[PDB]
Symmetry: D2
Subunit: 114 residues, 4 copies
């Protein structure tokens, strides 16, 4: 129900081995850990959650862009890229959070399909 | 060897049934038709060419964004989106041209892999 | 030393009256409110801070994109757009944080200049 | 009435000394040269045309991104970035064509205002 795809605008490639952490907003307005992983060779992270666990709520997808750039020997601007959104049941069911990274910039979009 | 993927930033969806025309630059500096199609339900166009036909050269991928927006009853800015690039054999072999569309803006990137 | 510029990719216009909240990470790892404002008719927000006040640190610029889209009567995807960065750690710089907004997407960039 | 602004997503800076060529589609469907220039130290190019000269038509703004990246000794993907649009067809407008450049990617947006 939740996939993350990360691309590198400098090299024209998937962004491989990027750490991604997903959080769900709690009752008390704190962010609790939900799911995490590292992007694959294709820049994707699947298997984060199941339909059962992925209930409506506010989620945060934190992409560790700073470590990615440092590993390539490049100095970046951002600490991370943050994507914060509400999951809504009356919308389509599958969510892809995509991000396109540069050292001083990033783009993100949502592809929400049935 | 050549794929095109188009996404809609307004609706958060693949951009379906978008016309795409690919041209190769000729000897005489004109653009000759090479391949075309319409994006699928997943916003993708595959099957444009074969390894045999896709030789080094300058290519132009023209995405008919104006018709896409008009079909959705939205007034757009651009006539089309143009992506012009050199195919180079010493680089990886598979090229994905991706575009993310809004009515007054678009993003494009290349994912070139082996 | 800190300016924010926001554009609307749907309308082809500045994004006007966008709320922006800036935080700075404290010693204790909490996010302390630092400054806030709204974009002008030109999509810009100046006057957030001073060179004296804008010390080294980790800053978070939260752009209230959901409130913007909803005020236009549109239902967007994201809650906000958050831009988090270390500033002034090699001395004072001038930062422009720019953002380009669509209902299901945004991009952001930084322009950093050394006065 | 026509301005071009270019930023560099790698450096976090204006994209300086970027060549830009503007064409206008002629009666005979050819692209006629209209104006040209280079971005300044601020990444901007003004002075391309006048309200008198900038009549209705289909315009192409070609941003010479390959020449920019190569002048910095980098091998980029795209030949250029081309922005094609109808202008002034409901009367005179002011157009800003903005672009944000990376070696394998770019984004472009338009800001259109009615003076
Ligand atoms: N599923 C799939 C497969 C291959 C490529 C993509 C690209 C997504 C994507 C995201 C952002 Br953000 C921008 N700006 C761009 Br242009 C493209 C998606
Ligand atoms: N007028 C003005 C002054 C200073 C900065 C800007 C930035 C514009 C801009 C264009 C694109 Br294309 C993207 N993706 C992003 Br983000 C921002 C505009």
């Amino acid at each position: 129900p939740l996939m993350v795809k990360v691309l590198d605008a400098v090299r024209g490639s998937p962004a491989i081995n990027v750490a991604v952490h997903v959080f769900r907003k709690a009752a008390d307005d704190t962010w609790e850990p939900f799911a995490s992983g590292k992007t694959s060779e294709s820049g994707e992270l699947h298997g984060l959650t199941t339909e059962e666990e992925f209930v409506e709520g506010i989620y945060k997808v934190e992409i560790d862009t700073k470590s990615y750039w440092k590993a390539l020997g490049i100095s970046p601007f951002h600490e991370h890229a943050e994507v914060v959104f509400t999951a809504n049941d009356s919308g389509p069911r599958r969510y892809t959070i995509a991000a396109l990274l540069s050292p001083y910039s990033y783009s993100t979009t949502a592809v929400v399909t049935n």
